[PDB]
Swiss-Prot record, chain A:
One of its GO terms (molecular function) is acyl binding. Keywords: Acetylation, Electron transport, Fatty acid biosynthesis, Fatty acid metabolism, Lipid biosynthesis, Lipid metabolism, Mitochondrion, Phosphopantetheine, Phosphoprotein, Respiratory chain, Transit peptide, Transport. It comes from the Eukaryota. One of its GO terms (biological process) is fatty acid biosynthetic process. It comes from Bos taurus. It is found in: Mitochondrion. The modification O-(pantetheine 4'-phosphoryl)serine is found at S42. This is Acyl carrier protein, mitochondrial.
From Swiss-Prot, chain C:
It comes from Bos taurus (Bovine). The lineage of its organism: Eukaryota, Metazoa, Chordata, Craniata, Vertebrata. GO terms for biological process: mitochondrial ATP synthesis coupled electron transport; mitochondrial electron transport, NADH to ubiquinone. Accessory subunit of the mitochondrial membrane respiratory chain NADH dehydrogenase (Complex I), that is believed not to be involved in catalysis. Complex I functions in the transfer of electrons from NADH to the respiratory chain. The immediate electron acceptor for the enzyme is believed to be ubiquinone. Pfam families: NDUF_B6. This is NADH dehydrogenase [ubiquinone] 1 beta subcomplex subunit 6.
UniProtKB/Swiss-Prot annotation, chain E:
The chain crosses the membrane at residues 35-55, 82-102. Belongs to the complex I subunit 5 family. It is found in: Mitochondrion inner membrane. The chain holds residues 332 to 441 of 606 of the full protein. Core subunit of the mitochondrial membrane respiratory chain NADH dehydrogenase (Complex I) which catalyzes electron transfer from NADH through the respiratory chain, using ubiquinone as an electron acceptor. Essential for the catalytic activity and assembly of complex I. This is NADH-ubiquinone oxidoreductase chain 5.
From Swiss-Prot, chain H:
This is NADH-ubiquinone oxidoreductase chain 4. Keywords: Electron transport, Formylation, Membrane, Mitochondrion, Mitochondrion inner membrane, NAD, Respiratory chain, Translocase, Transmembrane, Transmembrane helix, Transport, Ubiquinone. GO terms for biological process: aerobic respiration; electron transport coupled proton transport; mitochondrial electron transport, NADH to ubiquinone; mitochondrial respiratory chain complex I assembly. It comes from Bos taurus (Bovine). It is found in: Mitochondrion inner membrane.
Amino acid sequence: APPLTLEGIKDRVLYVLKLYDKIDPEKLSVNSHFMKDLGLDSLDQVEIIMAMEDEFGFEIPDIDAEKLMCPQEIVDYIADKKDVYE
Amino acid sequence: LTHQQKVLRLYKRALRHLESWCIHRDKYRYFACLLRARFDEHKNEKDMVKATQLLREAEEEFWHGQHPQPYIFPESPGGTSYERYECYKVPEWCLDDWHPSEKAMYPDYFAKREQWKKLRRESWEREVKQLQEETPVGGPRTEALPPARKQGDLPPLWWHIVTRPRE
Amino acid sequence: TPEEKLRLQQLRELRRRWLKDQELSPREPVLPPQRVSTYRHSIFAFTHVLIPVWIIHYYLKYHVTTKPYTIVEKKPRIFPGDTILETGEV
Amino acid sequence: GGGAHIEPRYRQFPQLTRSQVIQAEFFSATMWFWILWRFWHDSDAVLGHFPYPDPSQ
Amino acid sequence: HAFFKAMLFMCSGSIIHSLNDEQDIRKMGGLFKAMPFTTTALIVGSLALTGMPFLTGFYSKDLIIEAANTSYTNAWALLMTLIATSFTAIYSTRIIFFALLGQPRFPTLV
Amino acid sequence: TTLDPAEYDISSETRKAQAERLAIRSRLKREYQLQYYDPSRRGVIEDPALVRWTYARSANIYPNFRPNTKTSLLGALFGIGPLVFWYYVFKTDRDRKEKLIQEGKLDRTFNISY
Amino acid sequence: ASHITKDMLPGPYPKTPEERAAAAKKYNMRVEDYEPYPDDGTGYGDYPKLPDRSQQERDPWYDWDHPDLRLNWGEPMHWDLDMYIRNRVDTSPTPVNWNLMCKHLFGFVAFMLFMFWVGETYPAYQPVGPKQYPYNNLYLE
Amino acid sequence: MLKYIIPTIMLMPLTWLSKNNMIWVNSTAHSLLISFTSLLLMNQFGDNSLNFSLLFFSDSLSTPLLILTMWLLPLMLMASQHHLSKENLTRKKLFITMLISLQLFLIMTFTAMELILFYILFEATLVPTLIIITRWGNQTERLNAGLYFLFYTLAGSLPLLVALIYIQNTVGSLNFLMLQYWVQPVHNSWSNVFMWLACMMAFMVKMPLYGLHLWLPKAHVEAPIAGSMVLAAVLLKLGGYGMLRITLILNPMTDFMAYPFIMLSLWGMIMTSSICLRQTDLKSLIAYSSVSHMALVIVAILIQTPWSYMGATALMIAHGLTSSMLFCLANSNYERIHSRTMILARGLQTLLPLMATWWLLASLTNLALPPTINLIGELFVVMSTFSWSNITIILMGVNMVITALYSLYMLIMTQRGKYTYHINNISPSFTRENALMSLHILPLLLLTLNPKIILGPL
Amino acid sequence: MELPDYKQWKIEGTPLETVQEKLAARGLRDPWGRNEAWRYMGGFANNVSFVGALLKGFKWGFAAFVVAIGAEYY
């Protein structure tokens, strides 16, 4: 019964950037590409969505790792999975 | 499955099976870097058996004590109410035979139906022409060129392009 | 990954483009078409229960005198003694 | 959707409708009044006991 | 007994729709997160399921375990029935201690 | 308990040139998707993995068959096997049951059925 | 209607590399652990050269399976090995056999020795002498 | 039959006499009109007995069984028209005439007044069935199956003639079943084994034992246009009932050697239904259901003493209506997907919603849900062979267990989805597809109100 | 709409978050602690109690229990 729009997904992804103490509110909004300050190998590829593992966290399969480098490419196909915006 | 992402698929579940074992919220969170501390022991070294003993002894203490009926994220391969939306199930393109006075309803949806089929009915002069060229003989996975060099139409058209929405 | 940068930006121009077409209510496109066309609690309630009790009684009083066994009622389970008799007890 | 009479939240504790709590507190009173006949008056075992019937000779 | 769980399924049926799905004893929180009425209905039937201090089936439960008082039983039967009554108590506070006690932990958009 | 089921093992570098077994199934899938997408099909694809699954199970067992073994002559322990045993039971009843029925009585007065 | 490589033949040593695959791509170049040698137990008419049996087994459980249809719903092209027991049979559990389930009922098997006794409430034990004497003593007086 | 044969032969110079495509509507019109006349003089009374006219009828007095034989020619013409309408009218006139020519001999059979009139009409079939098997099938293994249908039925039935002619000149004459008042008993000898055995074995070849059932999943698997003689071949199997006419009398006292027919057909019952749960051909799935709970009557006839004839008669026309419709459920849903492989027809129950009820109310008659004609039949057989020996509740109970898991396995294979393929399968189960699927359950649950019509003498 | 604007939580109470103080001899240190402390703080320290929760405070525990008793009583 509750609908959703696309202005909420832009904030929550952006908020958990600020919720992490490793990342300042001085990085770019949609595309810092993770490598800008992403480190190192492990724990900068799966830990970066380990906060959304609790929040959104619909089991997030093995393909979701290397697509998630582009931080806008995360925002792309969450709308495809959960039957979202128009 | 490369050795680079061999630990990573084990790293996602090492914390995931842990949170089904806690009772508080901070009990998991106080153990966060504590679980990371054993994982941060071998940081940067070789790729041989020198470092495979991180993994060759990770069978014990991970499979030993592995998730006594863990959390399952109910919309998943397993878990309850995962594939449940099936009484509707969206039978797309069941609209062939009607014997109308049943095609009276939705006059605009049936108007828009015949419009989209031109991409479906006419793309084989273009998409199948390069499909014998872009695929050399029998190569691996059959995605096309991702714009198809002028207009990707689609190749997956339209069964993956207009597929079933969930509700 | 450099490959799917060109991919999946046109997929939203195909999937959500169809899903743009999919949400469809212009001018309420159910026609239906043709045709036309609390307090009571009076005719809804009286039609339901009151009529069969007239029916089902009629196959009951006209039935005990026909079948050589009616309903097979038990005894009165009395302690003392009065009722329709006369017998008394201490 | 159609009516947003109970709004979604971001963990700010959406409250009650200020009438549900009246029916809520009414049915804790009806059961702890109903402890009346649990004590007053009903004991553990109203039977009477035997005073160790040893002298049977 | 027929008045117990058709209440109690339906009592918790308001909860599963309230988070829209989890039906897990994990990831719940405490009792009063704008849940005044049904938590009051939970603490009646789960107190009935403790073993009836003065509640509904006290005239069914107590009169049978004290009908097995004087009996020619297995003598391992009373060592199996009356021990099971103690296990019925930790049924009660378990759903209290995970769904009706703790700090609110579950994914957001309440 | 049925079974182990061997969910992790070793590699690297036991026969590293084993790859492009996916090239078989990618060839099939490129054959299938090009077959499956078309504007006018109106009907199933043959897919003879089913055809070789029925016809090698329905027929082609008796033209295969030779009685060269004794594990196909094992069937006398399975075909005529239990059928011997059911005869042994049923003639011990209806004979021990019979003598008690004639010599002496066992049933009561109200046994009209039967 | 396909007649060439319709099914198997009396194998399984009729130049096995020619079978998989002329068609029926069970093996790639007859070294794939599914070359049509597996006539396990000759003399049975069941499973000839047969792009078929004793191949790895126990259960296409239809999990994530993201290539495409892959598993059991969505129908990949040529992967049928043995079926009709595999649309209802799954994978490995946690521990292993340690058959404690028969040991679970063994607790009452020891308490079948408690079925020999009685459960009289009044009095207790008094199991060492003949003072117990279950039934009555003398007559009227 | 005064004249039931005489109107139903007059159906035959009506078909070729007609015009063009009117030949379907002209035949089905008049063929329904016999169903009043079939009921009309029959079902009379009733206490010892109705000898009917002459040497041509004993009216099928205590075993009705014949009204069901007359539904079918106006049931199969509406079924056969699905894939027949590509041939010539000169052969379309043929396939209606031999089908009537099969109903002609069945009408003088089941009544037959004799035992030697029975045999020559018991064998007067198998010529018009074989024409429907060999011509008008699908791809091959028709022709060997055309020969397996012979040479079991015909190898067994020739030692009837050696024994029936032997009786005709031994004790009076067999010509009447009512000159069978004088019957000498048949004791234990070494020639009287074979007199019993040759007279019995030709009936076993049609209603099968566990052995010699090898022709039954041959003719039914490879089968005409839409079950068109397969509906007939299920009646013809239960039209080998005549063991009820013979063995009640005419060697009455040989139960001494019933035991190799009991144990073979009582253990075979628990196995030949168990051997079908791994079938992959859908029409061969039903073809073994027809083996199992038909062979329950073979342990219900040889065990005498009714409360079994209460049930053994009700089981002959229990799946006379059930197993007919299951073939009609599979003669449909093959016109749309051109395979009988049960794997392939998935993705269903969304596409054709109206026929979901036709699956279930078929398969709810094998579960058999006691107020039907089915568990009034089995529960007289169960309460009969209990009184033979108590141990027979075990095998017959596990018979009830496995067929519960067996019938649902055909239902539940259609409750799946996503269909993966199939630009075809559009046709939303047209008016004919539900009409010939009806008139099966509409008499099947109707007769459960007063099923005193379905009973022996008894 | 945008209710979780940052610099809002900023750990001040939530005694669960003194466990990050406990690892000062260990050290991780900074990232991150504001996830589990989303709704740990706020007015969410209500956190219903011991047997008084199933008593519901023993609120009407003897309310009309003594108020009814009693008159007449002669």
